[PDB]
């Protein structure tokens, strides 16, 4: 199916002394492959997946250079944005940046993205066509004029449409044993009674990859959203994900309810029902 490569970066200022805390993470789909933490002892981009360990010194040197450059740009930015917003030197502020590319089943470029935020709010982002920018306020508009004059969009577009895609294909090929493998959810239903007239049915999906999944309930073959609770998809910690969906039902009527599970690893969606 589809794939993506995305990098996330977070810089938090330390106004009383020193440089900001900078954490960078890179993903292929739902798999973390590299990380950089300014508080770590290596001061190097580090591997987080076995398939990236085969890259040589040249690659690690390159990634470390580029990531340090990203941290210094955020360092400067924190000061520049502090001024744009007339803020004092006493508080801690955050800059977040996320960029990457999506590809289709054929591995060809689908779309690219580059978003930047200040204190958790939109700041500036590249538009879908990758040729212009969306600035949320007048400070971000000052950045947009800088970026237009320095032709930043052109540079990014070339990276997003080309380089990003090329590296994503290299990674999918090198990590094929896991990256190109889909792990279907292991499903089961549990039952719980709170009183003599009400019961809860919980449909579980475990050990799946990728994270995208759809869990839905039906009553007599009709979709049912009322009286349902769906938890956020969560990581199991071994690279797979979990999620559950519950429906509250009149005790004794459990057999009318069915859980439906949709996932890339299932050649056909599955249905679960509670037996007596």
């Amino acid at each position: 199916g589809s794939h993506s490569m995305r990098y996330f970066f977070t810089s938090v200022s330390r106004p009383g002394r020193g440089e900001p805390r900078f954490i960078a993470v890179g993903y292929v789909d739902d798999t973390q492959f590299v990380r950089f933490d300014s508080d770590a002892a290596s001061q190097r981009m580090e591997p987080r997946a076995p398939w990236i360990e085969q890259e040589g010194p040249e690659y690690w040197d390159g990634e470390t250079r580029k990531v340090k450059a990203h941290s210094q740009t955020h360092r400067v930015d924190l000061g520049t944005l502090r001024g744009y917003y007339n803020q004092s030197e006493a508080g801690s502020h955050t800059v977040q940046r996320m960029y990457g590319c999506d590809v289709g089943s054929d591995w060809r470029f689908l779309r690219g993205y580059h978003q930047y935020a200040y204190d958790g709010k939109d700041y500036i982002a590249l538009k879908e066509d990758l040729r212009s920018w969306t600035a949320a306020d007048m400070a971000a508009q000052t950045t947009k004029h800088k970026w237009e004059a320095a032709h930043v969009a052109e540079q990014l577009r070339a990276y997003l449409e080309g380089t990003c895609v090329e590296w994503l294909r290299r990674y999918l090929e090198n990590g094929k044993e896991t990256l190109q493998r889909t792990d279907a959810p292991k499903t089961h239903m549990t039952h719980h009674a709170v009183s003599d007239h009400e019961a809860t049915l919980r449909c579980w999906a475990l050990s799946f990859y990728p994270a995208e999944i759809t869990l839905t309930w039906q009553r007599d073959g009709e979709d049912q959203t009322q009286d349902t609770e769906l938890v956020e998809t969560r990581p199991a910690g071994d690279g797979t994900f979990q999620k559950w969906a519950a429906v509250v039902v009149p005790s004794g009527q459990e057999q009318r309810y069915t859980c439906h599970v949709q996932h890339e690893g299932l050649p056909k969606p599955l249905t679960l029902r509670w037996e007596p």
Binding site: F8, V12, D37, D119, E232, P235, G237, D238
Partner: protein, 100 residues
């Protein structure tokens, strides 16, 4: 600027079976700013060796982290996740329930 409180899920990596090893997870998400305190508790006491994932965030810019530790559950032992964050007046404790 914006402050968003964290959502918390406490659960096991593998299906829970008393007396058999596993991993206890505390997943915190949807919060802003990034500074957060998350402890895993065994019978109300802080577990010392707890690791966590590298900070990352969602599309809406909110952060998420996974805190985790090995554990061998038992019928008697109680586990919980305690979270403190600027958005919380008092720490929030979410007990581990094997059914969730």
């Amino acid at each position: 600027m914006i402050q968003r409180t964290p959502k918390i899920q406490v659960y096991s990596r593998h299906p829970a079976e008393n007396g058999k090893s596993n991993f206890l997870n505390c997943y915190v998400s949807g919060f802003h700013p990034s500074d957060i305190e998350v402890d895993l508790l065994k019978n109300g006491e802080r577990i010392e060796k707890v690791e966590h994932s590298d900070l990352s965030f969602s599309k809406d810019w909110s952060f998420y982290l996974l805190y985790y530790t090995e554990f061998t559950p038992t019928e008697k032992d109680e586990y919980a996740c305690r979270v403190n964050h600027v958005t919380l007046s008092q720490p929030k404790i979410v007990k581990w329930d094997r059914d969730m």
